[PDB]
């Protein structure tokens, strides 16, 4: 079962993580169309890493409009719902034990 991958962003087609999904591993600055996902889960990092993977995603390109924050083993059950599907762009921060979120803007 190679059904998980370790530190990606996946979002799925459908809802409730049901549905296809994508592997995501660097930050996107465009996406021309945007993704419409159903759900978005980050898969669970309890690894003796200093940095948990911390996603963020973006309904406008540039990393700028609407902003969607997950985290390490945090799932939506709608992205559609919570706002806004359509992911223009993602930037892909991490979390250290310290619980500071930093980003890498690429």
């Known amino acids: 079962g190679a059904d998980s991958c370790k530190y990606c962003l ?11 999904y994508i592997e995501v591993y660097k930050s996107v600055g465009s996406l021309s169309p945007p993704w419409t996902p159903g759900s978005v889960c980050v ?4 690894d003796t890493k200093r940095e948990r993977p911390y996603w963020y995603l973006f309904d ?9 924050g997950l985290g390490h083993g945090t799932c ?10 359509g992911i ?19």
């Open 10 to 20: 996946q979002l799925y087609d459908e809802t409730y993580e049901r549905g296809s």
């Open 43 to 46: 898969p669970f990092v309890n």
């Open 60 to 68: 406008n390109v540039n990393y700028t409009g609407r902003i969607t």
């Open 76 to 85: 939506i059950d709608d992205f559609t719902k919570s706002g806004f599907k």
């Open 88 to 106: 223009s762009s993602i930037k892909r921060c991490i979390q250290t034990k310290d619980g500071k979120v930093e980003c890498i803007n690429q």
